[PDB]
Amino acid sequence: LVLYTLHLSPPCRAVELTAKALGLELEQKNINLLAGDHLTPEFMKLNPQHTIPVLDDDGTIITESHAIMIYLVTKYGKDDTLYPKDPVQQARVNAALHFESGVLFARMRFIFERILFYGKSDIPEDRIEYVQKSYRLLEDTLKDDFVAGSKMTIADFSCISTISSIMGVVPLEQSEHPRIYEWIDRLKQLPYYEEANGGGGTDLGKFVLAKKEENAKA
Amino acid sequence: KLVLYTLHLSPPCRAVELTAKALGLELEQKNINLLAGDHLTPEFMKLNPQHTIPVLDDDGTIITESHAIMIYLVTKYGKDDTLYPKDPVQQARVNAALHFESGVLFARMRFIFERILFYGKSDIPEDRIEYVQKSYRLLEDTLKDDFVAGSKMTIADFSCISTISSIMGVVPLEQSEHPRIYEWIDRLKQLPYYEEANGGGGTDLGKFVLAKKEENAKA
Ligand SMILES: N[C@@H](CCC(=O)N[C@@H](CS)C(=O)NCC(=O)O)C(=O)O
Ligand SMILES: N[C@@H](CCC(=O)N[C@@H](CS)C(=O)NCC(=O)O)C(=O)O
């Protein structure tokens, strides 16, 4: 299994968490977004949307982190605990997956991408507010121990990959979000959490802040 | 007995309406007027703590979120899997397109529309327009086949067209640069239920956002 990837990228780290949970080894091929590696004609052939992650499973090309996670659990999970087959339980996981793509990740990207790639040095107040609203939505979703119920699923891997990044840029206040902090501690009990995700999320937040300051020059 | 907490102006609600028509299902609609804050009540919060529509009530079981609802309906009621394949590779292509709709097409539409509809804004910033125009290109390049996830129509087409048919009325979609998107829109327009389930509401939402933008300027 080959992952076209960059550790700073949240949906990349979502798939790394999944592969660790599944006991799969991934061969990582680095796509340096900061050098434009994803903008080549060769990469475009892999993904016409020119985004990472992309999985190569023995020549079969699977794009998009959520799709990749679902595919890996379906094909290689010894059971379905990370992505239930039961239709109602599965719908709850799917709903949380799309909440991650549509709300958590999208709002993070609306602050990050312009800093990382287009030379911006500001974070508009409305976009901070949009992120804080996404934190409230998440806190209210965490009625159980994990985002899509009492068992940990790929939806948690998706959500934490983003949360562990954006909170270093838009602070996530513990007194106001106790459930999110208890849930982060559950994920930090995983032996592979820091290698698969924690380090990379912390590093992305710091990088965004460092880039914002550097870009302020000239 | 399928009940949908819904508003016909809402894209993800029309994606589910298109899915129910394709499956031959009847939905009882319970109208949720977002402008009146019907989704922000304590009773609605119990249906969905994210307070979004659509929400499905299937004989007492609550299922949130349009893409989840579509997969659920095809899974449970499809006479075969053509709208959401069981094959893991073809399914992955559909899932990738569905998350493209939520993460890219819908998100960028909402980043223009929400502030006008609900928070009184009267402008559309140029950087937001570009974000949407970039999304059109991403979609155009995705459409190498007749439908967004291959040569067969799936729930990913319903999701994508419910947003595209809305945002094109506000951020114009230039035809000369996007022939594949126009050809695809015409394939969906051949469905006998397309206008009723989706078309009219997409057109109405676009005109409604432009009207409300004007209203907000005038106080
Ligand atoms: N829905 C996608 C989002 C992928 C995504 O946006 N990745 C970013 C990096 S975090 C990217 O590749 N950006 C480069 C580009 O959009 O051109 C997923 O979860 O795989
Ligand atoms: N990923 C969700 C998105 C739902 C969504 O944002 N719906 C809007 C109407 S188009 C809504 O209910 N907005 C009210 C709010 O967020 O408070 C889906 O596809 O169901």
Author numbering:
A (entry chain A): 4 to 221
B (entry chain B): 3 to 221
What does the paper behind this entry write?
However, significant local differences can be observed between the alleles at the C-terminal ends of H4 (containing the L119F mutation; residues from 113 to 128) and H8 (residues from 213 to 220). Leu119 normally forms part of the solvent-inaccessible hydrophobic core that stabilizes the conformation of helices H4, H5 and H8 of Uganda-GSTe2. However, to accommodate the bulkier Phe119 side chain in the Benin-GSTe2 structure, the N-terminal end of H4 has a dramatic bend, which increases the size of the H-site in comparison to the UG allele, where the cavity is tighter. The H-site surface representation of both proteins with a bound GSH confirms that the resistant BN allele has a larger putative DDT cavity than the susceptible UG allele. An assessment of the DDT dehydrochlorinase activity of the recombinant 119 F resistant enzyme (Benin) and that of susceptible L119 revealed that the 119 F allele is 3.4 times more efficient at metabolizing DDT (82.9% DDT depletion after 1 hr reaction in the presence of the cofactor glutathione (GSH); P < 0.001) than the L119 allele (24.4% depletion). Overall, these structural analyses demonstrate that the L119F mutation is the causative mutation that confers DDT resistance.
The topology of GSTe2 indicates that the 221 amino acids of the An. funestus GSTe2 (afGSTe2) are divided into two distinct domains similar to that of An. gambiae (92% similarity between the two species, with a difference of 20 amino acids). The active site is located in a deep cleft formed at the interface of the two domains, specifically by the interaction of H1 and H3 from the N-terminal domain and H4, H6 and H8 from the C-terminal domain.
